[PDB]
């Protein structure tokens, strides 16, 4: 399997920018907290500190140079995360610093559900990839709350030992969930029993800022110790550590597509790794005019070549990038 590791590590050798946008305003903070594609990858949404969710049509963006959002939604507070529904093309969730979990029609801007149970800042939301009605959120109140789109109040809650910074549903089960906690660990639960975690992954020295599913069998986590960590669902300790980037403080973003991992860095750059090798595959350096990349996401086009992703730094600069 070594030769396949080689061919996969040398698959890409260059990067090409396709577009450049600005999330901003009065020279204020314009950090982009979240970037997510809709189900068909026709549109992508951008959310950050300016309290605004901006939606863009992908095909319109990568043509001409002048980029106005297809729909812009003003919010009450600063936004930390967004997530599109895998079942409903217009359903798009958002979490803010008030602890609110708002369900949006990403186009009409209407509000169908406003969930207000979190008592402190909410860091992450995510839709269940195998249940259309379910979604989840995690907050600084050491709580992971489960929501149903057909109900006003939460259906269940997992009580953690410290702050919850990121949540994610498994892409292979409607009952498996994972979240990264301030206790430097990654917790893995079967929502049927929440007493009672399935696994607690130890290895990080700082709070687990990010946690994504590479697949149904492998998780990738990002923590503020300049470390990415690859875990197996069955092994309580990491399979491989990815170093080379600088992530000691901020939510710099983490994204995974198939066999490739991308994360931001505090030298104003995006780093790309292959999940079976610890060394950096390649790096893209943002221009500048203390700046850190803040959000990344793969354009995971079903049945195709995930050669393109979107990254965004703390300056509000957003770039669509194709791997050559």
């Amino acid at each position: 399997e070594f030769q396949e590791c080689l061919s996969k590590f040398t698959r890409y050798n260059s990067v090409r920018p396709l577009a450049t946008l600005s999330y901003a305003l009065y020279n204020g903070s314009s950090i982009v907290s979240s970037i997510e594609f809709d189900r068909d990858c026709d549109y992508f949404a951008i959310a950050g500190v300016t309290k605004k969710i901006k939606v863009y049509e992908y095909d319109t963006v990568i043509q001409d140079a002048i980029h106005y959002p297809e729909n812009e939604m003003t919010c009450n507070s600063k936004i930390s995360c967004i997530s599109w529904s895998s079942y409903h093309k217009n359903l798009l969730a958002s979490s803010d610093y008030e602890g609110t979990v708002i369900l949006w029609d990403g186009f009409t801007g209407q509000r169908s559900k406003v969930y207000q149970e979190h008592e402190k800042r909410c860091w992450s939301v995510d839709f269940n990839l195998m249940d259309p009605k379910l979604l989840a959120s995690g907050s600084d109140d050491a709580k992971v709350k489960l929501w149903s789109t057909n109900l006003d109040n939460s259906v269940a809650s997992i009580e953690a030992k410290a702050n919850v910074c990121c949540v994610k549903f498994s892409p292979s089960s409607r009952y498996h969930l994972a979240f990264g906690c301030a206790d430097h660990c990654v917790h893995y639960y079967d929502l049927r029993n929440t007493k009672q975690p399935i696994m607690v992954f130890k290895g990080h020295r700082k709070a687990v800022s990010y946690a994504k599913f590479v697949s149904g069998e492998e998780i990738v986590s990002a923590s503020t110790d300049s470390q990415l960590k690859l875990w197996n669902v069955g092994k309580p300790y990491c399979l491989r550590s990815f170093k080379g980037h600088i992530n000691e403080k901020n939510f710099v973003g983490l994204a995974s597509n198939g066999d490739y991992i991308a994360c931001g860095s505090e030298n104003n750059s995006l780093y790309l790794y292959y999940k079976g090798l610890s060394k950096t595959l390649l790096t893209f350096k943002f221009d500048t005019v203390n700046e850190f990349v803040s959000a990344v996401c793969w354009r995971a086009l079903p049945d195709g070549e995930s050669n393109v992703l979107i990254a965004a730094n703390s300056q509000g600069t957003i770039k669509v990038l194709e791997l050559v």
């Binding site: 907290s33 500190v49 600063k78 702050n163 301030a182 206790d183 709070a207 403080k249 901020n250």
Partner: peptide, 11 residues
């Protein structure tokens, strides 16, 4: 500012 990851002691 914002986007500051939390931190646990633990004493």
């Amino acid at each position: 500012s914002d986007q500051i990851v939390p931190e646990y002691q633990e004493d």
